[PDB]
Every structure is written in structure tokens, then in C-alpha cells.
């Protein structure tokens, strides 16, 4: 839910397990996701014990009609989002994890895996990009409703 809000895009996955002893095929596209360090070990241990299904969504004819008519008034809610403080704890949690990821990437360069810094850079990029998008909506609101005067 946290990433859904922060990214402005639904973060959902559908999965099915393999029976004990059964080996998966060559297939496994694996769309990249930032996994926090406290979870990455367990993720890696069990990632090949299941597979991901192709997810799609649907709505009814009435849902279609109602959602267009809902939009005729729901537009107001898009210009009053306030996403930066709704789930503020997520970005802080990610930064808290990012710092330990950067500690590990520093330890990798120290003496002597496959480029932890680039992974950490993509994570910090994603988190920052989401934060700037939040500010973009805030500035847009400031431009529309505050910079008008008498």
C-alpha cells in the first residue's frame, strides 16, 4: 500500500508455489523491486519456490459509466492530494534501509556482491523521484490556488 501511494501506481503481485521437490523452468523474467536488507536474505532463499502470474483488471459496464460520472466531481480530490505527509513514514523507512545498504556497498569497496552501490543508487533514485513528484503536485496546487490575488 505504501509503494502504491508513493509511486502513484498500484503495487500488487499474484503468486503460486511449486510443490516440494519440483524445479522451475528457464522462465522467470523477474521485474526488479527494491527489497530491504532485513528481508533480502529470506527473499533470496525462497524466490525460486514460487512463480508470478500475469495480473490484469476489469470493471463492469455500470462501473465504467459511474467512474466517468464520478470523475465529473472526483477531479477536486486530485487537486487536494497531500501525498507528502500521508505516508511520510515510508520514505523515512526507505532512507533508514538505504543507509544500511550504502554501509554494505561501502564495505564491498573497502577490501572485497556484484556492485551493491548501483542497486542502492537505483533505490535512492526511485525514493527521491517519488518525493519530487509529491513536491510537483504541491507546487502545482500553489500555482493554481495561491498565486492569484485580488
Amino acid at each position: 500500500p505504501t509503494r502504491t501511494i508513493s509511486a502513484g501506481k498500484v503495487n500488487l503481485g499474484a503468486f503460486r508455489t511449486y510443490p516440494k521437490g519440483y524445479k522451475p523452468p528457464d522462465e522467470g523474467p523477474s521485474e526488479y523491486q527494491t527489497i530491504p536488507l532485513n528481508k533480502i536474505e529470506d527473499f533470496g532463499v525462497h524466490c525460486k519456490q514460487y512463480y508470478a502470474l500475469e495480473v490484469s483488471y476489469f470493471k463492469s459496464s455500470l462501473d465504467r459509466k459511474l467512474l466517468e460520472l464520478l470523475w465529473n466531481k472526483y477531479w477536486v480530490n486530485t487537486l487536494s492530494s497531500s501525498s507528502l505527509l500521508t505516508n511520510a513514514d515510508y520514505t523515512t523507512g526507505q532512507v533508514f534501509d538505504l543507509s544500511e545498504k550504502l554501509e554494505q556497498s561501502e564495505a564491498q569497496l573497502g577490501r572485497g556482491s556484484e556492485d551493491k552501490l548501483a542497486k542502492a543508487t537505483r533505490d535512492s533514485c526511485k525514493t527521491t523521484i517519488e518525493a519530487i513528484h509529491g513536491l510537483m503536485s504541491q507546487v502545482i496546487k500553489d500555482k493554481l490556488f495561491n498565486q492569484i490575488n485580488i
Partner: protein, 49 residues
């Protein structure tokens, strides 16, 4: 004994209770991110010679 969350103002003879709590969790995470980025950039620059 940490039963009462606050402090005493002995001069004005009052008890200033602990209330001022905001989003301090972000600034601590940004603080550790800053420290780790400092040590990392030093270690990255250390590579060349």
C-alpha cells in the same frame, strides 16, 4: 524514574511537560544517510591513487 514525561523550570516554578513531538524520525534517517554518504564518498575517492 521516567514515570512523568517532562522537566522542571525551577526559576519560574513550573513543570514543562513533554509534548513537543513532530516527525523526528525523518531527520534521524536523513542524518544516518548523510553520515554513510560522507564515509562512502571518501572511500570512492580513495580508489583513484
Amino acid at each position: 524514574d521516567n514515570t512523568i514525561h517532562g522537566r522542571i523550570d525551577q526559576v519560574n516554578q513550573l513543570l514543562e511537560l513533554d509534548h513537543q513531538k513532530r516527525g523526528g524520525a525523518r531527520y534521524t534517517a536523513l542524518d544516518k544517510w548523510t553520515n554513510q554518504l560522507n564515509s562512502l564518498n571518501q572511500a570512492v575517492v580513495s580508489k583513484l591513487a
